[PDB]
Curated annotation (Swiss-Prot), chain A:
GO terms for cellular component: mitochondrial inner membrane; mitochondrial large ribosomal subunit; mitochondrial ribosome; mitochondrion. Belongs to the mitochondrion-specific ribosomal protein mL51 family. GO terms for molecular function: structural constituent of ribosome. Transmembrane segments: none annotated. Keywords: Mitochondrion, Ribonucleoprotein, Ribosomal protein, Transit peptide. It comes from the Eukaryota. This is Large ribosomal subunit protein mL51. The lineage of its organism: Eukaryota, Metazoa, Chordata, Craniata, Vertebrata. The chain holds residues 32 to 128 of 128 of the full protein.
Swiss-Prot record, chain B:
It comes from Homo sapiens. It is found in: Mitochondrion. Signal peptide: none annotated. This is Large ribosomal subunit protein mL50. The gene is MRPL50. It comes from the Eukaryota. The chain holds residues 49 to 158 of 158 of the full protein. Component of the mitochondrial large ribosomal subunit (mt-LSU). Mature mammalian 55S mitochondrial ribosomes consist of a small (28S) and a large (39S) subunit. The 28S small subunit contains a 12S ribosomal RNA (12S mt-rRNA) and 30 different proteins. The 39S large subunit contains a 16S rRNA (16S mt-rRNA), a copy of mitochondrial valine transfer RNA (mt-tRNA(Val)), which plays an integral structural role, and 52 different proteins. Belongs to the mitochondrion-specific ribosomal protein mL50 family. Keywords: Mitochondrion, Ribonucleoprotein, Ribosomal protein. GO terms for biological process: mitochondrial translation.
Swiss-Prot record, chain C:
Belongs to the ribonuclease III family. Mitochondrion-specific ribosomal protein mL44 subfamily. This is Large ribosomal subunit protein mL44. The chain holds residues 57 to 111 of 332 of the full protein. It is found in: Mitochondrion. The gene is MRPL44. The lineage of its organism: Eukaryota, Metazoa, Chordata, Craniata, Vertebrata. It comes from Homo sapiens. Disulfide bonds: none annotated.
From Swiss-Prot, chain D:
It is found in: Mitochondrion. High relative levels in skeletal muscle and testis. Lower levels of expression in the heart, brain, placenta, lung, liver, kidney, pancreas, spleen, thymus, prostate, ovary, small intestine, colon and leukocytes. Expression is coregulated with TWNK. Disulfide bonds: none annotated. Component of the mitochondrial large ribosomal subunit (mt-LSU). Mature mammalian 55S mitochondrial ribosomes consist of a small (28S) and a large (39S) subunit. The 28S small subunit contains a 12S ribosomal RNA (12S mt-rRNA) and 30 different proteins. The 39S large subunit contains a 16S rRNA (16S mt-rRNA), a copy of mitochondrial valine transfer RNA (mt-tRNA(Val)), which plays an integral structural role, and 52 different proteins. Belongs to the mitochondrion-specific ribosomal protein mL43 family. This is Large ribosomal subunit protein mL43.
């Protein structure tokens, strides 16, 4: 049997949050703040992909270039093997060549 | 200190002396003559338009909305607006006040 | 099982009127409402109002 | 399949067309929502067509409950006692009119 | 005396301006203290809900970075040698544990790394979305334009009772400009309310305008909006980004 016997506790969500109410504020800052900032300078994330979409191979290459001088050892080796595998995949296997 | 003047109904019924009242307040606001077509003069002058619509909204209680504030170019247009009338009963109050048959009952759990 | 009078969607006057109408007949509704009561129901309702003592 | 479901013989309920024809429908119990997009077709049905439907065949008693529900329904009760409950969840006005006419 | 606000930008030869009432917040029923007209290219564009959907979904998804990650079959711990050699026993051929078939294996096609979803619309599309959303807020009788946000008291019950009396809505987005001339009364009022919001005019956006029921602008705000949004019409190619000098552009 997979199904649960009792229905779950009620998940109550506050739609008038602090974060939900001011979502999208200081977006659209460049257009009507005479272009002092870009809207991509509002992004808060990893230091390599802040305003950059990328592939899986391209994300790994960019992370190795911008950060891989200060990564941990096992994480750096795993990133090396991932870039090797993804090069072998994208440039040799698949349909549509 | 200034708390709670009561809410006002949105319903409206235009009175029967609407023509005399409009001509009286146009004579009062514009300070001009009748000559031939009082209901064809324009309201591009925004001070005169504001004085007319503010005086009417003070008197009759209904006020022109913004989407209809756009479309008033003549006094014929505000005369055609003040013959519209609307009604602010609920849906259930309007439904039970229709000619319901003897075999249709409705209830409201709200 | 319970009577249909005790389930939620129920109105007596509309049911008597529809009972008159679906048989394609014209009953005078007072005589039909007279016909649907019973002597046992009368005695039981007065027994219920007297065990509680309500006039 | 026919071996897996029950079966009955073709029958009238109480010899309808012999004497007088009687409408075999007793009730229609409607439960629609005030707010909620799933009950929009039923909301418009209660607006425009249930009054003419009630005037059309007066043997039927119609109830509209107007209850908060994620799926609106119609319960059709017949003379022999059977109860048929159908969902009018996200349907047109024409589909609901077809459904209550077939019921 | 009445407050009249004529548009200072040049209108086209046809296409006369659209108007709106000027309310205030000092009194309790002080609506209709003046009458303003607005630029029809900003407040009367075509309704265009496709552009609303484009800018709304861009605004929701361009900031998103999802930090989901699972371990592939090369990162799960262990799994080196070949268990039960290829031809001897009668089990199924396997070359490593932690292959994705096994319990405790790595995922075959799972999420990979912190993935970004960044893309930018052309700026004319975003400005067109703002003009479209202002027009949609006007035509459905939702927009209200004030002379100055100033309450007499500065307590939130006054603000919510006034918004109830004027039949605005359950939520309302209040806009002032420049974030420093916001007076103390409205700030101390709406700093506690949960559905009423103050933003500077730089932070106007399609998502907050759709999320809140009405939208309350100011007369310096509507002049600012007309200038910044009409500048996209009649503008050249960039030639370098507009933060650089450009003799006309401040
Ligand atoms: Mg390994
Ligand atoms: Mg192998
Ligand atoms: Mg695992
Ligand atoms: Mg384990």
């Amino acid at each position: 049997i997979g199904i649960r016997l009792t229905l779950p506790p009620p998940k109550v969500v506050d739609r008038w949050n602090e974060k939900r109410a001011m979502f999208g504020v200081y977006d659209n800052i460049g257009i009507l703040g005479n272009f002092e900032k870009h809207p991509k300078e509002l992004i808060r994330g990893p230091i390599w992909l802040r305003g950059w979409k990328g592939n899986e191979l391209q994300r790994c290459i960019r992370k190795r270039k911008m950060v891989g001088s200060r990564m941990f050892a096992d994480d750096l080796h795993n990133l090396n093997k991932r870039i090797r595998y993804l090069y072998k995949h994208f440039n040799r296997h698949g349909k549509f060549r | 200190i200034l708390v709670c003047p009561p809410l006002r109904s949105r319903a409206y019924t235009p009175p029967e002396d609407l023509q005399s009242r409009l001509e009286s307040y146009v004579k009062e606001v514009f300070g001009s003559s009748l000559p031939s077509n009082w209901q064809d003069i324009s309201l591009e002058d925004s001070r005169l338009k504001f004085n007319l619509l503010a005086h009417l909204a003070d008197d009759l209680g209904h006020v022109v909305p913004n989407s209809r504030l756009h479309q008033m170019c003549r006094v014929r247009d505000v005369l055609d607006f003040y013959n519209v009338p609307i009604q602010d009963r609920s849906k259930f109050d309007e439904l039970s006040a229709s000619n319901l048959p003897p075999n249709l009952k409705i209830t409201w759990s709200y | 099982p319970v009577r249909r009078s005790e389930k939620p969607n129920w109105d007596y006057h509309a049911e008597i009127q529809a009972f008159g109408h679906r048989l394609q007949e014209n009953f005078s509704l007072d005589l039909l409402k007279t016909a649907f009561v019973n002597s046992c129901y009368i005695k039981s309702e007065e027994a219920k109002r007297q065990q509680l003592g309500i006039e | 399949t026919a071996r897996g479901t029950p079966s009955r013989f073709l029958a009238s309920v109480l010899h309808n067309g012999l004497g007088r024809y009687v409408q075999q429908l007793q009730r229609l119990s409607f439960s629609v929502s005030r707010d909620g997009a799933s009950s929009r077709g039923a909301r418009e049905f209660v607006e425009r067509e249930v009054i003419d439907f009630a005037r059309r065949n007066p043997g039927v008693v119609i109830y509209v409950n107007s209850r908060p529900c994620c799926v609106p329904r119609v319960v059709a009760e017949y003379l022999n006692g059977a109860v048929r409950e159908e969902s009018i969840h996200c349907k047109s006005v024409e589909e609901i009119s077809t459904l209550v006419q077939k019921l | 005396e009445p407050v009249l606000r004529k548009v200072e930008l040049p209108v086209p030869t046809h296409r006369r301006p659209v108007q709106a009432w000027v309310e205030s917040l000092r009194g309790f029923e002080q609506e209709r203290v003046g009458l303003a007209d607005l630029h029809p290219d900003v407040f009367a564009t075509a309704p265009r809900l496709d552009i609303l959907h484009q800018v709304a979904m861009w605004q929701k998804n361009f900031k998103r970075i999802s930090y989901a990650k699972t371990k592939t079959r090369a990162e799960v711990r262990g799994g080196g040698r070949k268990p039960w050699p290829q031809k001897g026993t009668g089990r199924a051929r396997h070359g490593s544990i932690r292959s994705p078939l096994w319990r405790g294996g790595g995922v075959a096609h799972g999420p990979r790394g912190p993935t970004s979803y960044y893309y930018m619309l052309p700026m004319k599309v975003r400005a067109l979305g703002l003009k479209v959303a202002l027009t949609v807020k006007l035509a459905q009788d939702d927009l209200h334009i004030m002379d100055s946000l100033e309450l007499p008291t500065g307590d939130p019950q006054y603000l919510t009772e006034l918004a109830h009396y004027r039949r605005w809505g359950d939520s309302v987005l209040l806009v002032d400009l420049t974030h420093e001339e916001m007076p103390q009364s409205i700030v101390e009022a709406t700093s506690r309310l949960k559905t009423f919001n103050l933003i500077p005019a730089v932070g106007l956006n399609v998502h907050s305008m759709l999320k809140h029921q009405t939208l309350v602008l100011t007369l310096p705000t509507v002049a600012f909006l007309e200038d910044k949004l009409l500048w996209q019409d009649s503008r050249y190619r960039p030639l370098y980004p507009f933060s650089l000098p450009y003799s006309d552009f401040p």
